[PDB]
Amino acid sequence: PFTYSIEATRNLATTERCIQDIRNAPVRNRSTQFQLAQQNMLAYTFGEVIPGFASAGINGMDYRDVIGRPVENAVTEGTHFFRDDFRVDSNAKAKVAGDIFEIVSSAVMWNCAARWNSLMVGEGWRSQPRYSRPTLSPSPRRQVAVLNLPRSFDWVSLLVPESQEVIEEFRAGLRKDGLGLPTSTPDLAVVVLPEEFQNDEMWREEIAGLTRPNQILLSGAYQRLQGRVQPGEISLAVAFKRSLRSDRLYQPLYEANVMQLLLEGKLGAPKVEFEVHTLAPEGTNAFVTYEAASLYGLAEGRSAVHRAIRELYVPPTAADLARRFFAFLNERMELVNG
Amino acid sequence: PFTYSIEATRNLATTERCIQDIRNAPVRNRSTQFQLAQQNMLAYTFGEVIPGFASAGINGMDYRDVIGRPVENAVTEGTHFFRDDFRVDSNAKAKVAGDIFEIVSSAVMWNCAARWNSLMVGEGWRSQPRYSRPTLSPSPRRQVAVLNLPRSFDWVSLLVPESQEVIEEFRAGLRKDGLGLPTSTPDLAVVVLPEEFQNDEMWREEIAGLTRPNQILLSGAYQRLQGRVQPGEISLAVAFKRSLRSDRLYQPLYEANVMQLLLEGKLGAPKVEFEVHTLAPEGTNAFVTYEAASLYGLAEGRSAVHRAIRELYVPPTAADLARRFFAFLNERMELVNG
DNA sequence: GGTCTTCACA
DNA sequence: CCGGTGTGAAGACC
DNA sequence: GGTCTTCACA
DNA sequence: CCGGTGTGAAGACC
Ligand SMILES: [Mg+2]
Ligand SMILES: [Mg+2]
Ligand SMILES: [Mg+2]
Ligand SMILES: [Mg+2]
Incomplete structure (x- = not known):
């Protein structure tokens, strides 16, 4: 969830976790060991929360801290599962942060457009x-x-x-x-x-x-x-x-x-x-x-x-x-x- | 020199070294600890060698290997001086390497232009x-x-x-x-x-x-x-x-x-x-x-x-x-x- | 045609 | 997709 | 003036 | 200035 429940992480499938260990399946010209499955972390952190249309404590939270929660949740999970072996390069974090920012902003705009359309049809505000x-x-x-x-x-x-x-x-x-x-x-x-x-x-x-x-x-x-x-x-x-x-x-x-x-x-x-x-x-x-x-x-x-x-x-x-x-x-x- | 002479590094003044210690003089918003003095490395590695206008071994060397010598010479010097504490972020290396590429290529073009002008003023080839x-x-x-x-x-x-x-x-x-x-x-x-x-x-x-x-x-x-x-x-x-x-x-x-x-x-x-x-x-x-x-x-x-x-x-x-x-x-x- | 492996985009 | 840089010119600040 | 500090560029 | 990235689509391959 949004706050990294331990029990929620425990009840995840191996293919649904935020970090995938590819140490036994190397990429062609890359030295990646642990990869950040950004879709999994989007579904984990923001699975039931849409910023701007959620509780007032998330709608007023600094936007730099809402965009940046999935990566730290992933880091916590990876440290939990792969202790003393976990390490993710900063460039991977930069890429995933950019993608998450774009996707979450698009979701907020989609919800706003849905509310606008519902009003325009004549179903109230x-x-x-x-x-x-x-x-x-x-x-x-x-x-x-x-x-x-x-x-x-x-x-x-x-x-x-x-x-x-x-x-x-x-x-x-x-x-x-x-x-x-x-x-x-x-x-x-x-x-x-x-x-x-x-x-x-x-x-x-x-x-x-x-x-x-x-x-x-x-x-x-x-x-x-x-x-x-x-x-x-x-x-x-x-x-x-x-x-x-x-x-x-x-x-x-x-x-x-x-x-x-x-x-x-x-x-x-x-x-x-x-x-x-x-x-x-x-x-x-x-x-x-x-x-x-x-x-x-x-x-x-x-x-x-x-x-x-x-x-x-x-x-x-x-x-x-x-x-x-x-x-x-x-x-x-x-x-x-x- | 081009091959990291130890005695040549010993003869350098503290302000002429390839690596500057700024641990006691932090930057305003950066966490840098050691800084790559790109001009000092340029004067150290290429102070008597210009690629393309030097020995046949340097001229024919892979260009990816000529552009990359200063960074590794600086890394060797930093390991020599600050052992077990030296660390340089990859982004600093990327910036410095780009600058080295541009400057050395410009120097090669300058030498070519100088020879061209000397020929074209009728002074020979x-x-x-x-x-x-x-x-x-x-x-x-x-x-x-x-x-x-x-x-x-x-x-x-x-x-x-x-x-x-x-x-x-x-x-x-x-x-x-x-x-x-x-x-x-x-x-x-x-x-x-x-x-x-x-x-x-x-x-x-x-x-x-x-x-x-x-x-x-x-x-x-x-x-x-x-x-x-x-x-x-x-x-x-x-x-x-x-x-x-x-x-x-x-x-x-x-x-x-x-x-x-x-x-x-x-x-x-x-x-x-x-x-x-x-x-x-x-x-x-x-x-x-x-x-x-x-x-x-x-x-x-x-x-x-x-x-x-x-x-x-x-x-x-x-x-x-x-x-x-x-x-x-x-x-x-x-x-x-x- | 169906599954796996790789590569360009951003 | 982005985040950590080295340097030269502008800016206090006496 | 002129000396040290900071910031934008690439 | 640049190098390490995740994903979808196109390219092999009985
Ligand atoms: Mg964009
Ligand atoms: Mg350029
Ligand atoms: Mg884009
Ligand atoms: Mg340029």
Whole structure:
């Protein structure tokens, strides 16, 4: 659980434990001995707790301490089972911490979107944790879906085929000369729910924990909307980064530049709302560096110039992130007619 | 020395040693105990040896083995001095190794440029190591300068003022709307020698080793060329990266895109030659990703489309790097009138 | 076609 | 995915 | 001035 | 500046 019960760890299967001993099964070019099964620790620590929608002692806890509990629970378990032999490299912890931060933030945003959809359908406003009720007029057409994009996802398959044809032709013309348009997958994307799923109940209910079925449900939700989202319904794109460095911050800038070039220069979309979340921006000047012009149309000067990154946000708590997302939805869905 | 002489380490002053004890002088927010003095290790290991311009055993040695000698020499010294207490974190070693790679490669390129200039001012072709003599016609107007750019360098101050005013006006127009154009400084830049430095004897003499005076000479050779280089004499720009990851390769792409936007779309330069030098590209797909198009001129598609990165190079030895640079000089400076 | 082993992505 | 660095320029602080 | 301390960059 | 990582998908293999 969230507090490392000893009896709960005892009653786990060997394949369900947070740490897997692979000392007798080495990896090809790695010297790993004990590996961190991040899905197991997500199901263990957050199996029945979702930050921001849990007891008030977890919703107000520092967000740096909520993201960082699974790793220390794993360390405790590994020390219990493999005493004086347990050792996990710091780089493994860094990777797993980044992944856990992204997944937990996505789960919080999913619960917020589920509450918003339940309100919009006209089923009242839930009040188990106290959040401000939006002033927007309820309407089923103003429903959203939060998609956790996979590793090598190009995010163009979410567009309608008539919107994919232009992108395909442009990429084929680029390939004719042997060139390409590589990009990293944005961590998250929020889109308006298509007209066919306006009655489905899977977009109206909240998950009680990050169990393995719920992890699969959250991870596989992108496949339901493939080839269905209009180009103008891409509400928000989020790039999570648990920590920033003066050189590591250029990856989201490149992702945003490529996405805006594809969505604005070719599809005529109004604008792309790309933002970056972080937990420790100290030691850098990201608040000024991210105040950068989009590398699209600068050489011609015929379109309006704007920031490539909408905003850099540092959530202190999960409840603050939930409130920010609710305010963003209330502000954004106003201009969409329904 | 290059092989960790014990008597040579005994003769070093306490401030000239490869490892500094800062256990009694902690840093503000770091837990460092022993610090790797990278300049001291550079002066110790390569104080009388330059790879590619030394004995045939060092020239033909694996480049991954030359880049990595200073770190292990420092580790041996630290074990000798602080036994059973010495410990250096792997991240410090990674940082130092990257810096060593960049600096030694820049030194090799500087020696190649010095020999090229000495040949092209009609002083003959040095032959202590055997390299192919270029077939180009000698002329003083074709000498080159290799510049190791420092951190937070604008690299536009190298341009003549008339060229600088265009970039300044563009940046002021960007700033008026509250925007900006941030970038990282390319690790190196090769430019044609200005007409006032043709008769200088500093650009023809090679260095015997990476002693501290030579380090200062190579690091500070960019101040001499501020406001002298025309916007069309930027021959080559090189980004050094010891190893490539599937996300760390997007920072050179951003650097190249910004550089080409500034030089091709705002100054009328023919083309910018940007290439990446790596030692371990295994584990990623970089020979295909780096085969990408420039995010400039694709909004309307009027100018010809070309690659952002010229080539990704993996040098096996230092002699191969010297030969590549000589071939590049012979091929490129042929198109300079005179 | 079905199970295992490896590799790129992030 | 990230976290631990070495150094040169800017910043107190008399 | 000018000397020691701190911070951002890469 | 970089090196040690977990996982899903593609590649062998009677
Ligand atoms: Mg990602
Ligand atoms: Mg991310
Ligand atoms: Mg650099
Ligand atoms: Mg570099």
